[PDB]
Amino acid sequence: PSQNLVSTFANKVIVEENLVNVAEIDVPFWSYWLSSAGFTSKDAFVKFAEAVKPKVAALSTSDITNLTVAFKRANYYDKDLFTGIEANVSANFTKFETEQLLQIVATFDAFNHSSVAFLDDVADSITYCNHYLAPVRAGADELATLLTYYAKNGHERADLLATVARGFSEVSLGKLSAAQRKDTVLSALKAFQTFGFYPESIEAVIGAALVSPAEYSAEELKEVEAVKVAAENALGGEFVLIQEG
Amino acid sequence: SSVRDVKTGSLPTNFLTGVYRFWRSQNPAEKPHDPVNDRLLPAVVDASDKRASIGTWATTFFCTIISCNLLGLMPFNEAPTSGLGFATGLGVSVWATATILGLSKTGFKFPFIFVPLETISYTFRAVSLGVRLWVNMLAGHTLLHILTGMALALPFSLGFFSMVPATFGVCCLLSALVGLEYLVAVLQSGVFSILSTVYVGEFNHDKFIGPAAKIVK
Amino acid sequence: MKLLPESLQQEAATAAVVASWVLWHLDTQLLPTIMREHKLHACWAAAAKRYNEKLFKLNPSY
Amino acid sequence: SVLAASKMVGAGCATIALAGVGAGLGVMFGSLINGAARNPNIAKQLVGYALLGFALTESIALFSLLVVFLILFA
Amino acid sequence: MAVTSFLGKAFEKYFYDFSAYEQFGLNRFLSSKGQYVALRHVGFVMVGVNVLLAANFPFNPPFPTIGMCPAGWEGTWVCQADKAKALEMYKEWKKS
Amino acid sequence: EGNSVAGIIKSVNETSGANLLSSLKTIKAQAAPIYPAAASSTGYSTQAKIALFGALSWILYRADGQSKAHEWIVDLNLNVLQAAWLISFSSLIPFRAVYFAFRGMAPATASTLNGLKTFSSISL
Amino acid sequence: RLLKLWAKRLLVSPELAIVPLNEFDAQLASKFEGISPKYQELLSAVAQGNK
Ligand SMILES: [Zn+2]
């Protein structure tokens, strides 16, 4: 008679409601690990958002980036919740590290959520409150996401551009796959042309499109050559490729 | 979950700073061809990422070996290093660390009769690095024990307070021997870590991913 | 007098445990403190000229 | 006990190599004195080489003594 | 009232202030202070080995004697080179 | 714990002109760093007593095992030969010069802090 | 207000009293490294403290 008993136990106790009811104690922890394991259901994250919504403003930075990455993976946008997360980031921006801010800005770039104060606090935290080689450990897709975020919102911060231009090099772009490198180079060159800012490290972006121009279409090559001529005029010389020697 | 407070400028902090900077200076980084600026800074950071932490490893081995070597000279104490398995395990550990680094550089691929002869010449570093330090510690303790018995015999068979000059001379010889053992303890710890640095710096060399494209002026 | 111990693997594992503890204690407890002192002094000594020139340019008191 | 007798004879013949390593070590330390007399401005560098040299030279003594132990107490 | 405070202060006063190089006036017999430190080192070794040997004796030594006895035990049970024979001779010497 | 210079500014602005030169020393002493005074001398720590009793138990256990050993008297005399050198190192080593040599080993203590100068951060 | 403004400055950093006011502009320059070194080591050594 054990099979009828385990059928009664299996449909009433181990359910999604008790799953989201045991996940109320540490909800950015549980939402992060449940979203990484693949549990991306909408109604659970509707419950999760009103679970965090009082206690967002006193969360840790790791819990804030965990909650923000979890809601990026669930693709659920709650305007009051992300206003609370943005107020948390803007409150204690000095505590946040660059990798956490890049994940938070990736989530805030997936939606169209931005304030002027949030953008200034993220740029101040990446530029001044964090190590200047933290874009080097980033990975160029995260930095290109941040560059396209600041370009879309039109916020011009030349110090932040000089900071996240450091992360673009042969190393970080060589870590990417070919399609991801093409997407990252197009995003970074479009953002740098939007801001009118051509650093010395834009050429490692431009070279990443010109060493392998087989994946680039003709209009994309025209865009890359436009940014190449603009960077040649700004930096004060002509763009050559360096061979092996 | 609360850490202790440290005075800035303590003597152990200063000693370990000097020791770490020494073993870090044993394998210096190569100067790039381009000037170091923000274009070259990820290349420098990746060069530091590819370089093994021979400063930390050599400081580790120096501190543990000088601690055991000086433990041999405290009373009621023998060195752990005078054991065969301890010292030769440290030696085979440094040789295997250098070998594992060099194998991982070559894509985890193992390496015209010059190749087995150089293989034996390289493989003998595993024996030599541990047997040198272990043999020196074992010989010093063994020499002291044999010498102590002769010194004990002099006042055992010539009276306790009846032979002063010969007992004084042989105790001068024994005391100079223990001072030599202090010198050999410090020297063999330094020698182990220097040879550790050269053995791993044989494989510390890597490729500098510099700029592939540049604005010329 | 014996050259070999009772177990060579036990003495090798003792050496590995002692050296791995020295490695963890060095990387975790000693080197953070050392680099806090050293990099504070070194950052000030490396940035004294640029810092004082930048602060001299920002200062409106002259 | 002819095996133990040959063990004593073999160890006593085994430690002849300490003569050659002591002559070499004295040559190296005399050259260290000479090189410090030629150029004392780098003398604290040279002593380092001397210690390193003594290091590897000492090893040839210990591979002697190890054989002595492998003759005596194996 | 405390013990470790008085022990620290007393060992400080013995370590730093009490100096038998000047209290006994040994600057006339010895040249320098470092010579006194070397001779006090070797004298410490001599007194220590004599206290150990003097402490427990008469015994058959495990260290190799150079064919010399203590001048009172020519062949009793102290100078015996064979150890089991020395053990049974010690037994018939302990029965007395 | 707020900014002490902000407390200096508030306390100086809160005084009147007659009270200023009188209250400057108390405004100095209010925003001055805490250097905590010496507490009452207590017993040894739990860890200090554990260290001393464990060292004594290790010394007694090793002396017992050295007594049990085959060449026992030369073990107990090796202890004398090592304690002699630990005695002579207290007399020989120039501990002030060794302290300042170790201070020269680290660059943080080898030089003074060369940092902010007065003429850059002045506020007239 | 002037006594209060100088009181805050001489409370935070009392080493400004060793430069007379009438000579202060005589010390400056366009670059910070060009400031006259007459008072610089004295300012640093007084700022290090009373001991
Ligand atoms: Zn021993």
TrEMBL record, chain B:
Positions that bind Zn(2+) 1: 78, 141, 145
Transmembrane segments: 54-72, 84-103, 112-135, 142-161
Membrane topology: Multi-pass membrane protein
GO molecular function term, any single one: proton-transporting ATP synthase activity, rotational mechanism
Coiled coil recorded as keyword: no
Binding site for Zn(2+) 3: 141, 145
The protein, known as: F-ATPase protein 6
Naturally occurring in which organism (per UniProt): Polytomella sp. Pringsheim 198.80
TrEMBL record, chain C:
Protein name: Mitochondrial F1F0 ATP synthase associated 14 kDa protein
Organism per entry: Polytomella sp. Pringsheim 198.80
The gene coding this protein: asa5
Automatic annotation (TrEMBL), chain D:
Signal peptide stretch: none
Full-protein positions shown: 54 to 127 of 127
Source taxonomy: Eukaryota, Viridiplantae, Chlorophyta, core chlorophytes, Chlorophyceae
Domain V-ATPase proteolipid subunit C-like: 9-71
Single GO BP term: proton motive force-driven ATP synthesis
Annotated transmembrane regions: 8-34, 46-73
Record-given protein name: Mitochondrial ATP synthase subunit c
Assigned keywords, A-Z: CF(0), Hydrogen ion transport, Ion transport, Lipid-binding, Membrane, Transmembrane, Transmembrane helix, Transport
Family to which the UniProt record says this protein belongs: Belongs to the ATPase C chain family.
GO MF annotation: an example: proton transmembrane transporter activity
Membrane topology: Multi-pass membrane protein
Any one GO cellular component localisation term in the record: mitochondrion
Residue stretches in coiled coil: none
Record localization: Membrane; Mitochondrion
From TrEMBL, chain F:
Designated name of the protein: Mitochondrial ATP synthase subunit ASA6
Residue window of the full protein shown: 28 to 151 of 151
